[PDB]
Amino acid sequence: MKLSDLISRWIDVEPSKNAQIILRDRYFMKDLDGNYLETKWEDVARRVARVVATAELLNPSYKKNEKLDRIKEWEDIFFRVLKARLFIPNSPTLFNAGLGVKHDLLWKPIDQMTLEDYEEIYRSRNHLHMLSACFVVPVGDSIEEIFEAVKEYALITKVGGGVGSNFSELRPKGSFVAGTHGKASGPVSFMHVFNSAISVVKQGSRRRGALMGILNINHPDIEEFIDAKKVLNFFNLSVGFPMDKKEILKLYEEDGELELSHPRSTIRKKVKIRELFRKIATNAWKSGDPGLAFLGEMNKYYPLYPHRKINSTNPCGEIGLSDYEACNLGSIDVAKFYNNGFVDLEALQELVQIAVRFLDNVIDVNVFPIDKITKAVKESRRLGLGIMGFADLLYKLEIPYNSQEARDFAANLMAFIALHAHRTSYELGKEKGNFPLLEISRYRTEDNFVPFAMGMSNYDDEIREVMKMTKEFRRNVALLTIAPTGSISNIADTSSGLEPNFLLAYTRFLLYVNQVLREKLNPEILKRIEKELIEKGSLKDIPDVPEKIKKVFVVALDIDPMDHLLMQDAFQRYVDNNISKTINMPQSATVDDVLNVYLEALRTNVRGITVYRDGSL
Amino acid sequence: MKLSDLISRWIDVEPSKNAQIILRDRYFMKDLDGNYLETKWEDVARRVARVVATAELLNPSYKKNEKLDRIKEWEDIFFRVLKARLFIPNSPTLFNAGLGVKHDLLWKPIDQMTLEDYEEIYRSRNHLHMLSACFVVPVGDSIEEIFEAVKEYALITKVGGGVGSNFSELRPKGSFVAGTHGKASGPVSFMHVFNSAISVVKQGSRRRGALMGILNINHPDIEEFIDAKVLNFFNLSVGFPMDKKEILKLYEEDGELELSHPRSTIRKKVKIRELFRKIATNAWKSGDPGLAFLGEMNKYYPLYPHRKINSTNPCGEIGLSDYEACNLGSIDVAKFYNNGFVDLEALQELVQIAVRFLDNVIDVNVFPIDKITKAVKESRRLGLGIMGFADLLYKLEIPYNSQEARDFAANLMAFIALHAHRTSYELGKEKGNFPLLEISRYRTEDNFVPFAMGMSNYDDEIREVMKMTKEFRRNVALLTIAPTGSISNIADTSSGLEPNFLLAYTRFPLLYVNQVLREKLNPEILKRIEKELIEKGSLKDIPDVPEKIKKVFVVALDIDPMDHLLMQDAFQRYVDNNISKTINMPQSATVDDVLNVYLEALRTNVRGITVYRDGSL
Ligand SMILES: Cc1cn([C@H]2C[C@H](O)[C@@H](COP(=O)(O)OP(=O)(O)OP(=O)(O)O)O2)c(=O)[nH]c1=O
Ligand SMILES: Cc1cn([C@H]2C[C@H](O)[C@@H](COP(=O)(O)OP(=O)(O)OP(=O)(O)O)O2)c(=O)[nH]c1=O
Ligand SMILES: Nc1nc2c(ncn2[C@@H]2O[C@H](COP(=O)(O)OP(=O)(O)O)[C@@H](O)[C@H]2O)c(=O)[nH]1
Ligand SMILES: Nc1nc2c(ncn2[C@@H]2O[C@H](COP(=O)(O)OP(=O)(O)O)[C@@H](O)[C@H]2O)c(=O)[nH]1
Ligand SMILES: Nc1ncnc2c1ncn2[C@@H]1O[C@H](CO)[C@@H](O)[C@H]1O
Ligand SMILES: Nc1ncnc2c1ncn2[C@@H]1O[C@H](CO)[C@@H](O)[C@H]1O
Ligand SMILES: [Cl-]
Ligand SMILES: [Mg+2]
Ligand SMILES: [Mg+2]
To answer: Where dTTP 2 is bound, by residue (chain B) (predicted)?
Structure first.
């Protein structure tokens, strides 16, 4: 089907009452006095579409004679996709698009727009006009650098960004400080100061701070870091693995020792890698932190490595970012692409093309609080196009999430999306110009570079061809991710990212009940079991429910840890950034079960791991 | 007698074993390996003398044919007075003098010094070469300014400075934040972040952070601030930017104060008497917060209103404009006792030397922040003070708690003020005026004097000297009395203007007895009463101790609060900066007694108040 007709199917489907509450609470724009300027999702769609379309003012392929018509066309397509909720950008684009701009320009009819209206929108974007969710900054090994980084954290938090750092540059606790002849406090002590700062800074009531803190496995304070969370409430924590996954796996299998050391310290120590892993697994089993960040694996696929280097991810791990780099995200609701037993790839390809252009335009109208960030982003133009609604799409296709069928399906879907996204980046490089660093990247200096593992789709050869093409034209260093979509999946009334539904019937702080199950399950057998379902949190052992329904409508805890993990692998094979995935584990899971997840993760193509044991906290 | 004669009596007297412990612990310089580069006080005196004498390189009055000669002469004189411990600069001068300089230059014999050697010292002072104890920085009402100030606190603390701020620009808790449509955390919440930052920064083993936080009496969060003590690195003082007379009048009338802020809409009225009682109650319990009479400080500030004092450093003794710093040094007046009188001949010569020393410190000082370098160069504020005052009173057989002592104090301080300012005149003539002389009240007024006077017959001469400095003046202000918490130990003498807290106690088991008490008391009686003296902490109730001994050898708690306060007044009349003075109060004091001290303070010439009730903490 043509995308335009899929749009018609969804564009007048109104957000649920639950979605509308979320929108009214945090998304609808207000004036200084607190009056609503927006009252409907339609309003947000218009504002956002208009602001993002204005980036086309910079399009060198457009003559000044045609710019108005072209800009209006893009605003129109952006608006319709947004209103239909087929694609939604990360929350900050929704919150902040249009800040600074006159209120009589943001929602005026598109056919009344002039070239001057668009130029005024473009010129009037203020210093708060921050549209990207993901940031990384360095934390250098000096008081000057540390406290500058604290300030950066505050500035980023204020405008609504999530920020991460690798703290491994900071010399270990007890290390000599030549300036004062003193002893260093160590990275963990400094992280507490970052936490205290973020306790008093936020984007009002819209968005509290969200941080990632990584410390590398061979840092002498790694043991303290692993135990740090039991304070650091604004931090997610992961252990960094800068080395090859295969090197760490080999060390483990051979029961080897890791040398803990630091370039600006005499503090040295040998520890058994098995013991370190058991310590991590033990803490993860207890409380869910810390995760694992396979930085070496991120750099293996980073087109600018080794001249640039990924040392950290943003808060939910989905983007590996070089120093001062930021990234803007957006997600396609693939559940809306279900049609008569299949995914409408005709419509999907069209949307992928539009989505990549949209996200790339966001860069041009984005305003950052720090010049080094503005520059890093301009030079690389990293994007994070993902999906949401995947679990619900499987429901409609009658495919159990915990099956090889679903994983083969996932790989082919993500391969298809990657193919067309990268083809779009080629076309965009040709039209608007290549990202400034193309020439020094592996797309250029190397033959056969591909920014992911592939290996589970028939699209592989076509993907290889397109990667070769991007030696000459490429708008973006990387294009894909899968995010948690913690908010935007709720606005879209669909399942979150690649995650299975956590529950088929529940209440959040009200009542949510899976729309796809409503449509499949007979209302008789539904009214019955309803209570039992909300109490057991699964269909698994509710008697008198068709075996067919039970197998399809699985929830997170119905799906064993390895099936969670292998699904992450299927997607990561066709994602050039990373992926947010929780490996849910049953309350009855052991520390050794966690260790087994880690070892299996080391053999798969995943770039990081987060585990959460039911009943943990 | 001539100063040279007094130097001879003291120069070969080595510091007590007690002092040597302190020196070895944190004053003696070490190499990167931790080996001592200094092992005797005279080594410190050599290094410090040589570094500060190096400033004479910049003296425009010297011909190059004499520059070596002059520099050597000043190094020699500085060395002699330091070694003799007649005058000692603030700790950071002793800690940091010479950092960056090749070790073969700091201690070699002065007869081996060439002009090139001094130029080399001057060139190689590094970024840690910070020689001043007292700082103030502003904290502006924005996230950017707040966290820039946090960084400034860290940098200052690293090099061993003490820093204060007035936090009143920060809008009250709950105030609107336009950029986020949020609510402000308020100053007290942000002070916690400053405290957390300073918990992980220090000048090695030498000294931890030391901070002052002030909030003005009319700030809407004043009541929360008053109860704020989590803030362990802060001393707190309530700021009074209005005239002392105005607040006394409001108190006497049982009037109300309007609490308001420029960046907030909510105003509140409170009884000034209720506010004062809240302050007195907390100070009675815990010793905080103090009172800072900012308006009284600006009354005597030569640059007001062009420049403005909003805060003091940690112990309150210097009122500083934004980004201003000040270096201190104190003369041990106990060593000037001679046959029933103070030796004014020798003391005058030393005041002249110490003022030149302190002014030279500025030329070889390195600050961490450019705005501080600029503010210091423009004003050249100094803080020359005294220590050993209590022991001098002992030798003179004058009870600290008497009008006699207070009259003596005023006369002594007037003499010092007179000759310090005379020296600043001469220095202005020789080296050049401080750049802001022209816009100062020494120039723009008739009859400006930077203190109240009124208790000395030196007043007329002081008036004449201030008039002369209309034409020449090296320094905006010259005088303070500091706690001397460390340098009075090094000099083996009483601290600042404070009475001795105790006459005898046990060091580590070593019995210490005040040296003067030992010389005046019959050794037999001493051995007899020692036990009871340590137990009771005073001679007053000990039987068979001569009445005259009891009256003369008073300690802090023998002296009533009003007698502490009036001594502070006597000094403050002839000090152009402020004074560190603890108003000790007996454990049996009431909150009403504290209130009465506050009210008497408003009637006196004191510029601030700190009280401490014995046994409260
Ligand atoms: C000064 C100081 C540093 N540190 C830590 C912070 C950094 O991680 C590390 C270095 O701080 P720096 O500010 O670089 O100290 P320095 O440059 O004077 O000493 P060096 O030449 O040895 O680098 O030490 C503390 O933990 N506490 C302190 O007081
Ligand atoms: C952003 C933010 C500010 N503040 C406080 C810090 C400052 O005291 C005060 C101003 O912060 P600013 O950073 O100056 O906020 P703003 O410029 O976006 O808004 P405005 O025009 O109203 O100034 O608000 C918070 O307490 N929490 C926050 O999250
Ligand atoms: N500052 C801040 N950033 C967040 C928060 N939630 C998410 N982010 C950022 O947004 C990224 C994507 O999260 P996602 O759940 O997909 O956000 P959504 O766009 O709001 O649905 C995260 O990795 C963070 O970088 C938050 O509560 N605060
Ligand atoms: N950072 C820091 N500053 C201090 C400390 N003690 C004193 N200061 C600063 O030095 C000033 C004078 O204090 P004083 O006791 O006379 O210092 P001394 O030279 O060490 O004897 C104080 O007002 C503070 O500004 C400390 O422990 N740490
Ligand atoms: N170290 C971490 N701790 C908690 N959540 C993490 C971590 N790293 C990535 N995440 C992601 O953040 C989200 C937490 O709700 C999930 O998507 C999860 O996969
Ligand atoms: N608010 C305050 N102002 C000045 N000194 C204080 C204050 N609080 C405690 N003190 C202590 O009192 C002495 C100086 O008055 C120093 O020891 C200092 O640390
Ligand atoms: Cl009482
Ligand atoms: Mg350094
Ligand atoms: Mg502001």
So the answer is: 141, 143, 158, 171, 178-179, 185, 200-202
Residues of A with a known catalytic role: 314, 316, 318
Residues 6+ apart with CB under 8 A from A62: A56, A70
Distance of alpha carbon B415 from alpha carbon A401, whole angstroms: 91
Measured CA to CA, the distance from residue A61 to residue A357 in angstroms comes to: 14
Comparing CB atoms, the residue among B143, B185, B201 nearest residue A158 is B143
Range of the domain at A284: 1-617
Strand A235-240 and strand A291-293: pairing? parallel
Q: Is the CB of B298 under 6 A from ligand 6?
A: no
Exposure b/e, A298-314, CB count within 10 A at least 16 = b: bbbbbbbbeebbbbbbb
User: Which residue, among A328, A310, A329, A330, has the nearest Cα to A320 in the 3D structure?
Assistant: A310
Cβ–Cβ under 8 Å, residues A175 and A184: yes
CATH number at residue B347: 3.20.70.20
How many domains in chain A?
A: 1
Which of A370, A390, A377, A476 lies closest to A430 in space, CA to CA? A476
Q: Strand A162-166 relative to strand A211-216: parallel, antiparallel, unpaired?
A: parallel
Could you tell me if B350 and B3 are in contact, meaning their C-beta atoms sit under 8 angstroms apart? yes
Is the CB of B154 less than 8 angstroms away from the CB of A148? no
Ligand nearest to the CA of A221: 1
Residues with CB under 5 A from ligand 8 (ion): A 142
Structure tokens at B80: 């002699």
DSSP characters for A129-194? -----EEE----SSHHHHHHHHHHHHHHHHHT-EEEEE-TTSPPTT-EETTTTEE---HHHHHHHH
Those residues with Cβ within 8 angstroms of residue A502's Cβ, 6 or more apart along the chain or in another chain: A555, A556, A557
Structure tokens at A401: 């999430």
Residues of B in contact with A234 (CB under 8 A): none
For B146, which residue in chain A has the nearest alpha carbon? A151
Q: Is the shortest distance between the CB of A355 and ligand 3 below 6 Å?
A: no
Quick one: resolution in A? 1.8
- The Cβ of residue A509 has, within 10 Å, a number of other Cβ atoms equal to 3
- 3-class DSSP state of A514: coil
* Cβ-based neighbour number of residue B547 at 10 Å: 7
Q: Do A179 and B185 touch (CB under 8 A)?
A: no
- A62, with CB counted inside 10 A (0-12, 13-18, 19+), is middle
